[PDB]
Amino acid sequence: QVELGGGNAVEVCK
Amino acid sequence: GQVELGGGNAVEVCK
Amino acid sequence: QVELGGGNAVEVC
Amino acid sequence: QVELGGGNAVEVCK
Amino acid sequence: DIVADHVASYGVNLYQSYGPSGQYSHEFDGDEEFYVDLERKETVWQLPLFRRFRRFDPQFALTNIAVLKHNLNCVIKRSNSTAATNEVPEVTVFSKSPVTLGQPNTLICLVDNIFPPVVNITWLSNGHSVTEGVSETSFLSKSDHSFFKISYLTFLPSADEIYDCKVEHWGLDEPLLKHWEPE
Amino acid sequence: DIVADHVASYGVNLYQSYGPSGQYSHEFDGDEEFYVDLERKETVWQLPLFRRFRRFDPQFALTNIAVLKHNLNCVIKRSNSTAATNEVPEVTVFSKSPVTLGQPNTLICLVDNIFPPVVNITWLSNGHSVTEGVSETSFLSKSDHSFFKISYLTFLPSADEIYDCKVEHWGLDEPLLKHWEPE
Amino acid sequence: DIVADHVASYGVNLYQSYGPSGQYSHEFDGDEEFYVDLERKETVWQLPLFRRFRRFDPQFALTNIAVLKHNLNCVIKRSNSTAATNEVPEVTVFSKSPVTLGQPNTLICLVDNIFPPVVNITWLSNGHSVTEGVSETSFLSKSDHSFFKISYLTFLPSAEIYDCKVEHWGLDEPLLKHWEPE
Amino acid sequence: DIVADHVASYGVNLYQSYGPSGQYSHEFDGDEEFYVDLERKETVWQLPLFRRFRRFDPQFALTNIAVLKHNLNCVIKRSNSTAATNEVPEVTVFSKSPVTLGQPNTLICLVDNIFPPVVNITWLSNGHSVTEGVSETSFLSKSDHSFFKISYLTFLPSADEIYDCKVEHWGLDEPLLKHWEPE
Amino acid sequence: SPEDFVYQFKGMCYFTNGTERVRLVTRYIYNREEYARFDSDVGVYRAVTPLGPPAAEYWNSQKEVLERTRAELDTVCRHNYQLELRTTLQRRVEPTVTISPSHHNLLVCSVTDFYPAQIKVRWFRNDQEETTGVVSTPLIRNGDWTFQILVMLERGDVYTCHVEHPSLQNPIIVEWRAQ
Amino acid sequence: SPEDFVYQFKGMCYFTNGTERVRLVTRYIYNREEYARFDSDVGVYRAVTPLGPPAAEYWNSQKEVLERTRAELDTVCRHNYQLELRTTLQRRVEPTVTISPSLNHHNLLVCSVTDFYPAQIKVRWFRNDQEETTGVVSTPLIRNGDWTFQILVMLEMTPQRGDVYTCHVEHPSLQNPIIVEWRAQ
Amino acid sequence: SPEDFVYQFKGMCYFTNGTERVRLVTRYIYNREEYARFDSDVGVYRAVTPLGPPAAEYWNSQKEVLERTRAELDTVCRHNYQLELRTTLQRRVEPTVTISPSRTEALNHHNLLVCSVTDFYPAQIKVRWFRNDQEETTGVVSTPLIRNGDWTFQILVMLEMTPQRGDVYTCHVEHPSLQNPIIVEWRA
Amino acid sequence: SPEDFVYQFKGMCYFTNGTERVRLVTRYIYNREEYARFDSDVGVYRAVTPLGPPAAEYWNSQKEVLERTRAELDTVCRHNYQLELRTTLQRRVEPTVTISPSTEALNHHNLLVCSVTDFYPAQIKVRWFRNDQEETTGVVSTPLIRNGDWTFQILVMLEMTPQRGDVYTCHVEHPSLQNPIIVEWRA
Ligand SMILES: *[C@@H]1O[C@H](CO)[C@@H](O)[C@H](O)[C@H]1NC(C)=O
Ligand SMILES: *[C@@H]1O[C@H](CO)[C@@H](O)[C@H](O)[C@H]1NC(C)=O
Ligand SMILES: *[C@@H]1O[C@H](CO)[C@@H](O)[C@H](O)[C@H]1NC(C)=O
């Protein structure tokens, strides 16, 4: 199957 | 040559 | 720190 | 590994 | 003369008799860092990056400008009242980004070779003067001890709008108009 | 600590300000599985076995790295622009196989404890710089959040040929040289 | 992180549960100035120049270590009895002076990345354990709050192979590092 | 014509009519890497380092050589039986190392501009034909599509013995002799 | 030395007893300071330094970011592990054994180029397993999915170095006698 | 036109190779004629025009006023450079590169490299894969005045066949040079 | 594997330009994670990990503890530095320089000369190689500064040379404990 | 003299700056006249002489024969170069230098021969030095001699007149040498 990775989370920033 | 000193330690609040 | 600069000199008047 | 080389092309003959 | 990787002007002090108008500004590599509003006692930084990491006491500007008024009254007496020579300013108008209809842009009007530092820079859109979306820089110093000023105008490029930069200076006989339009 | 039979890193994301350079790689038991070429939008696997039985969408790397550039501007803003602390890298040179004067081999230069991840790992053979037969790995992650890089050098052991590994890092004062020669 | 011309550690305090082990030492530019023998109430300076021109009250060390014993009993209650994580030590052996196969020298065994500060560093000469001419330093602090220890061995280089034997909980077997005259 | 750092010839295959005879060899920067003995079906490498760590299937040589014999009957028919022109070879004899009467050495006989690839290269020591210690290279190719061969003779330098290189070719009228003696 | 600002994210999976006991720990690292992490045992984002509360508490309020990450233990860790079982954990590389010295006693048995890491090397004088005098180096990672380990050992006698490895059906034995 | 009397003062710092080679020159200017200046390289106040001897020698007579000015090499020039090192000297603005023309008739392709900082930049034109050494009309570096720059590189060419012209831009704010393409027809 | 619980405290002083720019940072460390610290630049106790708020908020409430800690910048850092200025910062140990080849003396086979500059203090040192008074800027392999731990240092500067005839190689060592540079020669 | 018919084929690879600039040229040669050739820069089989159109146009009509030939840039040139990179291109043999006159007499003009005899690869520099003064005149050097056994050789001669204490030295530079080899010769 197609391998994938962990999704990163967005920070509050601006 | 005076009396040397160092880090005064702080005490934590425990029973 | 506080930026600054350019000290001006006073003339005899 | 196994080396390779110039494959010759055959001409139309006779 | 003095070659250097970076040239900063920490103390562009200016005082004249006409206003009597003055200006205190700092510059780094030809760009204005800030200017002190002498009437409001406020340091006005010219970049968001400067307002967050830099601080400058406005009192050092008012102290130094007050010495200029003192030092000025002597050199007028020493030079036997030699007045300033009005220089002819050179005006140039260009845009900040390539011009595309409908996409917002910004016009720039450069007024070079200014002396004395007294000038009116107003914008004109198809004749009438525009007042909104206009901001300008202070008097930027030059190596020959003259000045140049830059006025900005954020606008929306359209087929039926032609802009002008109107410069009024004593070195000129009539108000100088420089034209700009989306070719 | 976390005891486990196998430890995998499905998402070693890295983005820095200097380059601005980034890297997306996966690791299994400390070895690099692949790395995504961010400039070409190409997944470059680090093994012939991986290139035949695995597939990974390179678009997920550019999406994930773009979030790092976003997250970076906030922790620098929140930490009051706290820069990285330059660490001193540890260099070690050894061969891949037992050395037999005449039998082709490969030299290995391990540069441990790298931070920040900016380094030059170059080879030197008898003074002269080597340019052919040199390949290196990406930045492999460490448990203490540092990095290490490994550069390879295919060579032919000879009685009169001495090799060197030249490492350039900001944490070092001068370019560090590690020596290796067949006894 | 903190750039400075000189970095001093006036109060390297250490207290652990595994036995009544403690340590009070001062450090300057990475070198140990002294250490207080907590059992003997004695300040032991690490240089002949220090023993003659410097003075430090050893009682202040016992005061500070006694607070550590109290503060240790406090963080154990807050951390729900979280024990220490055994780190893998790195051992390195080198000589103090160039080897001349007859000129007295001193072997140095640096044991880096020590945690927790419980380790045995013993020497081996041709298999047999060496006991005389061996001295070691206290636990010198590191930036990552771990420790490293250095053991010394005054020896006579002869055509004799020496080993440094390190015993730590993070290791599975006693680690031996080799050194021999070129 | 073609400038390059390195020029390799992966397939110097040759087939001739007389009588018949062929050769398959690889070359790198003008030196012979190996040659396939078409009668023994064996790849004979020309360097000790090559014989131990490199591999080439000799069957691909016999497969390709059969194509030359096939293509030869095509150009012979199309060119209306145009025979080869015998070229005059250039002979030169020199030693591999400086000669010091008693120290083993090796004589080298270079035969340049050989065409067609049919020649007999024999040595002569005091008139008599030498049979021991004689080895030669294959037909090395030239840019002008001619060939050159090099014959070697390991000998013991003595004040006696005057050695000769005897070349027999169709382009020559009589066997050409090049003389060599220890000064 | 120009200043540099480093940001890292490492979604690490910990496998034990196969694909059964799986632990997911995503770590958000600024330079070298990890300020926020998600733990599968905890279930939510936890702050590690004061640089993290503003981000961990915001990520716990949103259900689309906390539910997508909690499910990542199954869609990333256990999903990729099924491909490791057919490629990585099946990789067998046979070790290359070589014995050579560096009145004393120092024999170096160089076991090079092998995968995986599980390996046992034993020294034998004639047929006496040497339980003392064995100086072994830690497992050296060459970086190309191969390993290397050097086991040292400190009158006619035949010393042999026995190497056992999953990539070997029969043990490799290399001998070396003093001339 | 009313008469005007202008007085200026410019405390200028010159930096080279970082904070190693620093030179301070304060300039006392009347109208446009600079009459007195202090130089850190010289060390004292110098008169430059006949309007200056009464002012340069008065400022050298005071020892605390000449000492306050000599110390400004450290309290003004080198003091502010540490503050430029965290704001100005780190400012990187990536240039927005755009290609657009101004058929067998000769025309002009304009590679507009706009809004970039700092000033160091190199722009090159490429026809297929041959660097254009002729026909490159470049404008001088334009100072927008808002801490951004812009430069317009034009190419005098003929759009024939099927050739792909590219504009390669190098700037410190770029890991890889920015390349924008333009194909004929 | 027996369990162990470690607690450490590090009262560190940072000196720059002498006692002009001095910074005090006390670190309260549990096992290996520092959980609470005081910073003289900040002025109060700061929590570093969630293990610290119950300790940082209690130490800031007491006013005798915040005044005692701020004064430690003067009673510990600047007080001891005046004592370091007459003992440690005046310690000068002259380096012992020695040149010797690694491989045995070869007629012309390549060899590498090791210039061992051993036992010196402080750490600032510069070593340069010279072949017939020509400074060798290439082929010099230098090791990092080795900290012996007994208030001495050592550094080994190697040169990849080829032994010809005449060849007089010298190792030039400069150190603050030396008024003139120490030079050791080596002839083929 | 019997008649002979020769046919040749030369699959030559041209490398520049490593494997970055690689060019493949296969040459079909009849006797000494190359009649058809393939060029990777051209992309198809080209006829060079009137003996080639009947063969070049036939080999371009078949798509499997030109596609197999175009692909040989990767399976023959670039494939073998990875094996040359660890064997041939790593071969370094340092030269053995020998000085001897061509007849030894003082104040009588002679010729000193600096014999550089066993070195590989071909890059080499030889310089003569009389009393550490480089002799830029009177140096008669022979072209690079190819021994044929993967070794080279070059003979550099010097025209001089032997004196009392004149010391001539021969400086040899080679990629297999970190430092130049110097051999002296005293009268
Ligand atoms: C500029 O404007 C002022 C009033 O705002 C006016 O008095 C002055 O004449 C103007 N300048 C010129 C050159 O006309
Ligand atoms: C070494 O790396 C630096 C950046 O850290 C770079 O500027 C320099 O060009 C590199 N040197 C070489 C020889 O590649
Ligand atoms: C600290 O620096 C200042 C200026 O750099 C200097 O005047 C002073 O002598 C230095 N040392 C001190 C204050 O102890």
Distance, in Å, from the CA atom of F59 to the CA atom of F41, rounded to the nearest integer, reads: 7
Contact E120 CB / ligand 1 (< 6 Å):
yes
CA angle centred on E131, ends E127 and E134, rounded to 5°: 110
Please report how many Cα atoms fall inside a 13 Å half-sphere around the Cα of residue K76, on the Cβ side: 27
Angle between helices I63-70 and I53-61 (to 10 degrees): 90
Q: Three-state SS string across chain J, please?
A: CCCCCEEEEEEEEEEECCCCEEEEEEEEEECCEEEEEEECCCCCEEECCCCCHHHHHHHHHCHHHHHHHHCHHHHHHHHHHHHHCCCCCCCCECCEEEEEECCCCCEEEEEEEEEEECCCCEEEEEECCEECCCCEEECCCEECCCCCEEEEEEEEECCCCCCEEEEEEECCCCCCCEEEEEECC
Extract the tokens encoding K165.
């005839």
* For D7, nearest residue in chain H (alpha carbons): H64
Rounded to the nearest angstrom, the distance between the alpha carbon of J38 and the centre of ligand 3 is 24
Chain I residues whose C-beta is within 8 A of a chain A C-beta are 9, 11, 26, 28, 54-55, 58-59, 65, 68-69, 72, 75-76, 79-80, 82-83
The answer to whether residues F61 and A6 touch, using CB atoms and an 8 Å cutoff, is: no
Q: How far apart are CA E52 and CA J91, in angstroms?
A: 14
Q: Rounded CA gap, F163 and F134, in Å?
A: 13
Omega cis (within 30) before G181: no
Strand partners, G128: G125
Contact K36, K46 (CB under 8 A): yes
Give me the helix-helix angle, K63-70 and K53-61, nearest 10°. 90
**Sign of the torsion formed by the C-alpha atoms of G74, G79, G82 and G88:** negative
Crossing angle, helix L63-70 and helix L53-61, to 10 degrees?
A: 90
User: Bridge partners of B15?
Assistant: none
| 3-state SS track over L99-113 | EEECCCCCCCCEEEE
Q: What is the 3-state secondary structure (H, E, C) of H38-73?
A: CCCCEEEECCHHHHHHCECCCHHHHHHHHHHHHHHH
Inter-chain CB proximity F132 and L94 less than 8 Å: no
* Burial of J53: CB neighbours in 10 Å, binned 0-12, 13-18, 19+: middle
Q: CA–CA separation, H93 vs H110, rounded Å?
A: 6
Q: What whole-number distance in Å separates Cα of residue K5 and Cα of residue G138?
A: 19
Domain ranges of chain E: 8-78, 90-180
CA-CA-CA-CA torsion sign (G66, G69, G72, G74): negative
Structure tokens at K82: 């005046």
CA distance L128 to L130: 7
Phi, psi of H182 (to 5 degrees): -70, 80
Residue I70, phi then psi, degrees to nearest 5? -65, -35
Three-state SS string across chain E, please? CCCCCEEEEEEEEEEECCCCCEEEEEEECCEEEEEEECCCCEEEECCHHHHHHCCECCHHHHHHHHHHHHHHHHHHHHCCCCCCCCCCCEEEEEECCCCCCCCCEEEEEEEEEECCCCCEEEEEECCEEECCCEEECCCEECCCCCEEEEEEEEECCCCCCCEEEEEECCCCCCCEEEEECCC
Q: Are F183 and I100 in contact (CB under 8 A)?
A: no
CA distance to partner chain F, nearest, from residue I31 (Å): 6
- Helix boundaries (H) for chain K: 53-61, 63-70, 72, 78-84
Q: List phi, psi (to 5°) of F66.
A: -65, -30
Q: In whole angstroms, what is the distance from residue I10 CA to residue I15 CA?
A: 16
The dihedral built from the CA positions of residue H149, H152, H158 and H161, taken in this order, carries a sign that is: negative
Place of tokens 């710092």: J13
Structural domains of chain J, ranges and CATH numbers in brackets: 7-84 (3.10.320.10), 96-183 (2.60.40.10)
Report the candidate in I114, I105, I109 with the shortest Cα–Cα distance to residue I145. I114
Number of C-beta neighbours around residue L136 at 10 A: 8
DSSP letter (8 states) at residue D13: -
Torsion of CA E135, E139, E140, E143, to 10 degrees: 160
Question: Strand F147-155 relative to strand J149-157: parallel, antiparallel, unpaired?
Answer: unpaired
Tell me how far CA of residue L25 lies from CA of F181, I38, L69, L73, in angstroms: 40, 59, 10, 9
H/E segment holding residue G77: helix G59-78
Question: Which residues are bridge partners to F105 per DSSP?
Answer: F155
How many Cβ atoms sit within 10 Å of the Cβ of residue I155?
Answer: 3
Cross-chain CB nearest to H14 (options L2, L8, L77): L8
* Distance in angstroms (rounded) separating the CA atoms of residues I59 and I40: 15
- Of E86, E168, E177, best ligand 1 pocket probe by most atoms within 8 Å of the beta carbon: E168
Euclidean distance between CA atoms G105 and G107, whole angstroms: 7
Q: How far apart are CA G129 and CA G39, in angstroms?
A: 28
Q: What are phi and psi for residue I142, nearest 5 degrees?
A: -70, -25
Distance in angstroms (rounded) separating the CA atoms of residues I100 and I176:
8
Residue J80 in tokens: 């502010």
Distance CA H151, CA L32 (A): 24
The DSSP secondary-structure symbol of I73 reads I
Cross-strand pairs, G25? G12, G35
**Phi and psi based region of residue E133 (left: phi greater than 0; alpha: psi -120 to 50; beta: remaining):** left
Q: Is residue J155 within 8 Å of J180, Cβ to Cβ?
A: no
Q: State the Cα–Cα distance between residues F64 and E24, nearest whole angstrom.
A: 47
Among partner residues K1, K51, K154, which is closest to G78 by beta-carbon distance?
K51
Q: Is K18 in the pocket of ligand 3 (CB under 6 A)?
A: yes
| Main-chain phi, psi angles of F70, to 5 degrees | -70, -50
Say which CATH topology domain E8-78 has.
3.10.320
Q: What is the CA radius of gyration of chain L?
A: 25
Question: Do H30 and L146 meet the contact criterion of CB atoms below 8 Å apart?
Answer: yes
The structure tokens 């602090």 sit at G141
Q: Which residues contact I30 (CB under 8 A, 6 or more apart)?
A: F75, F79, F82, I6, I7, I8, I51
Q: How far apart are CA H171 and CA H87, in angstroms?
A: 5
Helix (H) and strand (E) counts for chain C?
0, 0
Q: Which of 2.60.40.10, 3.40.50.280, 3.40.50.12780, 3.30.420.40 is the CATH number of G90-179? A: 2.60.40.10
The residues, any chain, with a CB within 8 Å of residue I134's CB and separated by 6 or more, are I123, I151, I152, I153, I154
* L84 contact residues in H (CB cutoff 8 A): 8, 28
Asked if L77 lies within 8 A of H10 by C-beta distance, the reply is yes
The structure tokens listed for H119 are: 């020649």
Do E175 and E123 contact (CB within 8 A), yes or no? no
Assess H4–F contact: CB distance below 8 Å, yes or no.
no
The DSSP letter of residue L132 is: T
Structure-block tokens of residue H143: 């840019």
Is F160–K140 a contact, with Cβ atoms under 8 angstroms apart? no
> The sheet that has I158-164: what strands, in order across it?
I128-129, I120-125, I158-164, I172-177
H-only helix segments in chain H? 48-53, 59-78
What is the distance between the alpha carbons of residues K52 and K36, in angstroms, rounded to a whole number?
5
Experimental method: X-ray
- Find the helix or strand (DSSP H, E) in which B4 lies: strand B3-4
Name the fold adopted by E90-180.
Immunoglobulin-like (2.60.40)
DSSP string, I88-133: TTT--B--EEEEEE-----EEEEEEEEBSS--EEEEEETTEE--SS
Identify the bridge partners of residue F107 per DSSP, sorted by sequence position.
Answer: F95, F153
Please tell me which of the candidates J86, J175, J176 has its beta carbon nearest to residue F81: J86
Taking CA H103 as the corner, what is the angle to CA H100 and CA H106, rounded to the nearest 5 degrees?
A: 90
Exposure class string for F112-139: b at 16+ Cβ within 10 A, else e: ebbbbbbbebbbbbbeeebeebbebbbb
Residue G108 pairs in a beta bridge with G94, G152
Q: Is the CB of K82 under 6 A from ligand 3?
A: no
Pick from E127, E144, E31, E49: which is nearest to E87 by CA? Answer: E144
Closest ligand by atom to J73 CA: 3
Q: Is K133 left (phi over 0), alpha (psi -120 to 50) or beta?
A: left
**Contact exists between F and J (3 or more beta carbon pairs < 8 Å):** yes
Within 8 A by CB and 6+ apart from G60, the residues are B5, B6
Give dist(CA I133, CA G140) in Å, integer: 30
Query: Please, are residues F137 and F23 in contact by the beta-carbon 8 Å criterion?
Result: no
CA dist I146 and I117 (Å) reads 8
Residue K153, strand partner residues:
K120, K147
What is the maximal distance between C-alpha atoms in chain L? 78
Strand runs labelled E in chain H: 6-16, 21-28, 31-37, 42-45, 90-95, 105-114, 120-125, 128-129, 134-136, 140-141, 147-155, 163-168, 176-180
CA angle J22, J26, J30 (to 5 degrees): 155
Query: Contact, B1 vs G49, CB < 8 A?
Result: no
Q: Which two tokens stand for residue G159?
A: 């055509």
Contact G163, I135 (CB under 8 A): yes
Resolution in A: 3.5
CA G93-G94-G99 angle, 5° bins? 140
Pairing of strands J6-16, H140-141: unpaired
Q: Tell which residue, H56, D6, H22, H147, has the closest CA to residue L11.
A: D6
Scan for tokens 């202040």, then name that residue: G60
List the structure tokens of G1.
């992180």
CA of residue H108 relative to chain centroid, distance: 12
- Which residues of G, range 19-38, sit inside 8 Å of B by Cβ? 26
Query: How many Cα atoms within 13 Å fall on the side-chain side of residue I40?
Result: 21
Residues G155/G97, Cβ–Cβ less than 8 Å = no
Q: How far apart are CA J4 and CA E20, in angstroms?
A: 10
I133, G174 contact by CB (below 8 A) = no
Chain F neighbors of H49, CB-CB under 8 A = 102, 156
